[PDB]
Design a protein around this ligand. Structure first.
Ligand SMILES: Oc1ccccc1CNCC[C@]12C[C@H]3C[C@H](C[C@H](C3)C1)C2
Ligand SMILES: Oc1ccccc1CNCC[C@]12C[C@H]3C[C@H](C[C@H](C3)C1)C2
Ligand SMILES: [Mg+2]
Ligand SMILES: [Mg+2]
Lengths: 546, 546
């Protein structure tokens, strides 16, 4: 029956409400209880505030008008407004103190997830204050989660005029008995009830959600901690830079602030960063999530030499050049992790800070060829299988769905042993044709990967494994150096290839190395434990990179 | 005969040279003349500094080694190094005091313009200082102008070892007698002379360029003030955002810092901003230059209503949303200028600062329909001609080359009178088939525009002129407000349509309005007088928007 949920901003999706500054200021300054609310409301439908809410006048135009009303009100209540009394001040402070009511957003999210059309309907104002960006930021953080945002000052109507509820219904394409509307102000509920909407008067958050729980029949309170916000590919800004004649690099870009460049592993995609991209933009950073050379919409020349790290690196530098970026933070996972450590070692002027998930930094051994080295660790048997051009492409390109459904699994979900891959004759030799879906990924998320790899298959991705000798010669040049720029290493308890212990010597080369560690976390760090990864990266960024 | 020019960085493309801090520090601290240079040079080919220049060790690794050398040197010269003596300090200060030697860059530019292959060959170091970004920035500003940048610490060789000159020749694909090489250090010239290169010892800049002038036979000193740096379209990062199902917006993006969004006029393109894009990135800003709805690689639906400003504006806001930008600076020209004033009036929370070239802000007249209004100013006769869907498309799409070659002209170059366009039957009725090239544009720059308009022609661009009544109704909503956010108006003496006097009332609606004025400047502000426009925008941005 119910199909739509409507939330007010002030007092409902954001707290404390700014009305509750008129109350507290009055107490705090020992003025007549209600004096400020009366001045705020002066003149009713024709007073300064309604014209503000209707978009007739801007906030800065209103400030003095409210001032005059506060003067009138005090003259007739025979009190003095204090010295240095400032409506700009009271309102600046109130407006920057309002934060998202997290439990309320979360409930909105959940109902949107079970199919409700959600909307914010709010009496707001055209904000031209010097400090207006604060409110611009909150509104951005809020609106992305809703189907509609209806602002009094944009549509020229206000709660509780009946016409805005008609505007609302018409926007939702819903009849009034299909709608729950929450407000903290009863008068604003009134006309919604007249049309027969379910209404909720929001005093404390928990009680409003309990009423919301009961009326929608959807569990909203006490629910499991939800995932971080993900990316809808076709809502992203997509960016393309030609770093040289045959080679273009694609990336997705979100946020303002210091540039932070995410480098995915084998065989992944910018999409592997879907859970970090919102949260880092949110935490004040300019996220550039790449398709690394060989994948997705980035170019994928055939030749093996196009994928040695010396060339991959120079290319990432050119990418900064053409974007006009002097530096960026490089954060990598798996292959991307190996590459960012080499960015630190060969171009520290370009790297603001370096971070890797799973991949330790390990120096070249100038005494031992790296193919020989590789045979010393059975767990790296798969890297030998990848050598012969053609062999691994054919297994991996055979069934793309099967491929990703097989590879992308939690630590307790593994359907393949990395043991004796060459002997057995393939990575998937003893795994299912139709593997169950991992708990980590939806059917759709697998298909996006599938579609990506339809562009260029696995030749380019595999080539990364095919320059061992050439990379070793180049790495040997870096044996005299240390990474002295800020740097974070994040180990994953249950990555059975890139085990935590592999990283135990890193302090010999990177003496001021910071660490973080995720428990019960397989190889696919970013989607396995997205929350924990976001917190470790944002805490490190705020301290080492800001 | 000569075909390539090679420049060192320190002392040649950047001044003061950092060697000249070893000299001045010695004086400044009253230490033995040459003590610091000796320590710097300690050990010759095997000492700390050469391994630094070869990329064996990073700058921060070297700092203490140089320290130890300064200790040895003072022990044997029987002097005391002062208290609080700091090589990190001396070097930080020296490195941030080096600036581009502008006249030297300009000469490099010029020779590149007359066909020389230009290169920077420099003994430099891997910079991992906390303050390394400064040098990252200078190197970016320098390298974009040259064919090659060869860095000692990247190639593992150093001046004056003979092998780097062999590496140089091989990079240039040139024989030694085709190359001029400038250095401030004679020893570094030595091996270039042995191979038979023309060499120049750079003491003062002017004398080196005079020698360079004579040997290349190219005027380099006393030359006319050159244009600002322009954009090569295929070297730009290109970005695309779907603001809604049928509609994608394209833009080019350069730089880091506060976001600055450039909105071109009718009938233009992001490319109209080619002269501002580098300079504003350079001045520390994140330039997003659009293709506005209807042009270039942005979508161009047929329907007239898709181009009223209410929709164009909402759409620009969505563009901020999807890019994760809470605000931007909006700077517009012509139609783009009209649109940004309305962005200020309807979404001041999203606009950090607003700027228009040529286009005054003019309020709607609520008493007079804007079609009627339009007949009151003969100079706007062309706007009536644009009304009838089909008519103006056909003239304008007939010969694209002729179209832009006709439209894009300096104030003293005009080949069409805006007078009685409807009467005459077209904009180009009495102009040439094959117009001369304006002094403002090259043949190639016309063809890029030509190619752009081949995608969607003039239907979308023209539609901007076709919502007069609808825009007027919407503008009327804004009659109560004032623009109180920072705002700049730039008038162009000789725009005969958008005359300076048209803007004379703007202070009634925008009381803190800043102004700038360009003399001898036609309608095509950005390419007519690019230098002057850059200086007015950067000065205003630094003061009102930073
Ligand atoms: O090889 C490198 C190179 C550099 C950095 C890290 C690694 C570690 N690579 C692990 C990549 C992996 C290989 C194989 C297929 C699929 C699932 C597992 C088995 C893990 C992806
Ligand atoms: O109409 C508007 C609307 C809004 C803002 C400014 C203007 C002013 N538009 C001037 C555009 C112009 C029209 C015509 C063809 C070509 C050469 C000149 C004659 C100038 C471009
Ligand atoms: Mg409320
Ligand atoms: Mg020098």
């Amino acid at each position: 029956t119910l199909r739509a949920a409507v939330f007010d901003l002030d007092g409902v999706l954001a707290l404390p409400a700014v009305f509750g500054v008129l109350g507290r200021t009055e107490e705090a300054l020992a003025l007549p209880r209600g004096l400020l609310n009366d001045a705020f409301q002066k003149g009713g439908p024709e007073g300064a505030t309604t014209r503000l809410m209707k978009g007739e006048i801007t906030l800065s135009q209103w400030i003095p008008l409210m001032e005059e009303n506060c003067r009138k009100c005090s003259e007739t209540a025979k009190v003095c407004l204090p010295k240095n009394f400032s409506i700009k001040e009271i309102f600046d402070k109130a407006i920057s103190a309002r934060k998202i009511n997290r439990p309320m957003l979360q409930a909105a999210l959940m109902l949107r997830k079970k199919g409700f059309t959600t909307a914010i309907l709010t009496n707001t104002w055209l904000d031209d204050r010097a400090e207006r960006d604060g409110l611009a930021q909150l509104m951005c953080e809020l609106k992305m989660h809703f189907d509609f945002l209806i602002e009094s000052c944009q549509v020229g109507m206000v709660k509780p005029e009946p016409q805005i509820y008609k505007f609302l219904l018409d926007t939702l394409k819903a009849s009034p008995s299909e709608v729950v509307f929450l407000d903290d102000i009863g008068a604003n509920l009134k006309p919604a009830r007249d049309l027969g909407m379910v209404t909720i008067l929001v005093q404390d958050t928990d009680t409003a959600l309990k009423e919301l729980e009961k009326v929608t029949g959807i569990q909203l309170l006490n629910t499991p901690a939800p995932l971080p916000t993900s990316c809808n590919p076709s809502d992203m800004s997509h960016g393309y830079v030609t770093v040289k004649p045959r080679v273009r690099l694609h990336f997705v870009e979100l946020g303002s602030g210091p540039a932070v460049c995410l480098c995915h592993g084998f065989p992944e995609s910018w999409y592997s960063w879907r859970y970090q991209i919102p949260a880092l933009a949110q935490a004040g950073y300019r996220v550039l999530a790449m398709d690394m050379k060989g994948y997705g919409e980035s170019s994928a020349p055939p030749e093996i030499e196009e994928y040695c790290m010396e060339v991959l690196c120079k290319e990432m530098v050119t990418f900064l050049d053409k974007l006009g970026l002097s530096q960026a933070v490089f954060i990598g996972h798996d292959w991307g992790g190996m590459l960012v450590w080499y960015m630190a070692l060969f171009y520290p002027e370009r790297v603001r800070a370096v971070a890797s998930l799973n991949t330790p930094f390990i120096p070249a051994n100038p005494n031992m060829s790296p193919l020989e080295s590789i045979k010393a660790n059975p767990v790296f048997d798969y890297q030998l299988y990848f050598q012969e051009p053609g062999v691994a492409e054919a297994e991996l390109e055979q069934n793309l769905s099967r491929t990703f459904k097989s590879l992308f699994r939690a630590s307790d979900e593994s359907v393949l042993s990395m043991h004796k891959v060459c002997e057995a004759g393939g990575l998937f030799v003893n795994s299912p044709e139709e593997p169950s879906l991992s708990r980590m990924v939806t059917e759709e998320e697998i298909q996006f990967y599938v579609q990506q790899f339809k562009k260029s298959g696995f030749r380019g991705p595999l080539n990364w494994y095919r320059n061992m000798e050439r990379n070793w010669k180049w790495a040997c040049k870096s044996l005299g150096r240390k990474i002295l720029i800020p740097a974070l290493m994040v180990t994953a308890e249950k990555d059975f290839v890139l085990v935590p212990q592999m990283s135990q010597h890193m302090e010999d080369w990177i003496p001021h190395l910071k660490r973080g560690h995720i428990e019960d976390c397989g190889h696919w760090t970013q989607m396995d434990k997205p929350t924990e990864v976001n917190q470790i990266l944002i805490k490190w960024l705020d301290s080492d990179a800001r």
